[PDB]
Design an enzyme around this catalytic site. Structure first.
Site, PDB file in Angstrom:
ATOM      1  N   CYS A   1       0.827  -1.202   0.000  1.00  0.00           N
ATOM      2  CA  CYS A   1       0.000   0.000   0.000  1.00  0.00           C
ATOM      3  C   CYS A   1       0.868   1.262   0.000  1.00  0.00           C
ATOM      4  O   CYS A   1       1.698   1.469   0.878  1.00  0.00           O
ATOM      5  CB  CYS A   1      -0.939  -0.011   1.210  1.00  0.00           C
ATOM      6  SG  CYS A   1      -1.983   1.466   1.407  1.00  0.00           S
TER       7      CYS A   1
ATOM      8  N   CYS B   1       0.519   3.750   2.923  1.00  0.00           N
ATOM      9  CA  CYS B   1       1.139   3.047   4.053  1.00  0.00           C
ATOM     10  C   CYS B   1       2.659   3.140   4.010  1.00  0.00           C
ATOM     11  O   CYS B   1       3.305   3.355   5.032  1.00  0.00           O
ATOM     12  CB  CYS B   1       0.779   1.560   4.048  1.00  0.00           C
ATOM     13  SG  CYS B   1      -0.904   1.140   4.499  1.00  0.00           S
TER      14      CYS B   1
END
Length: 111
Positions: free
Chosen positions: A34, A37
């Site tokens: 991600c 992230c």
């Protein structure tokens, strides 16, 4: 030393670890693939180093699927500012996304 807690365990293990903290806790549920992230993960160590009074707990959703699923996480990165309150956990703020400015603002406001 690395200040970030790289959590590995069950939902109950996560709850108990949170309750072990002396003060404010930020829990970051993330995945390695991600983008937001990843970008948050690059700057968290610096925030953690400057705020040793706060416990930063990272929970990889791929290796701790049961914990994440039981905690109610869907979209990521999922951030929760929490604090032990008696034998219960109080949630102070929660949001999804790499909102670095809100992370910093929450840390400053809460202490």
């Amino acid at each position: 030393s690395d200040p970030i807690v790289h959590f590995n365990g069950t939902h109950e293990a996560l709850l108990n670890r949170i309750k072990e903290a002396p003060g404010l806790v930020l829990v970051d549920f993330f995945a390695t693939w991600c983008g937001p992230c990843q970008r948050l993960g690059q700057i968290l160590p610096s925030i953690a180093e400057a705020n040793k009074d706060v416990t930063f707990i990272k929970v990889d959703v791929d290796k701790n699927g049961n914990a994440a699923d039981a905690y109610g996480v869907s979209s990521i990165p999922a951030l929760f500012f929490v604090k032990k309150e008696g034998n219960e956990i109080k949630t102070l703020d929660q949001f999804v996304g790499a909102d670095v400015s809100r992370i910093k603002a929450d840390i400053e406001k809460f202490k």
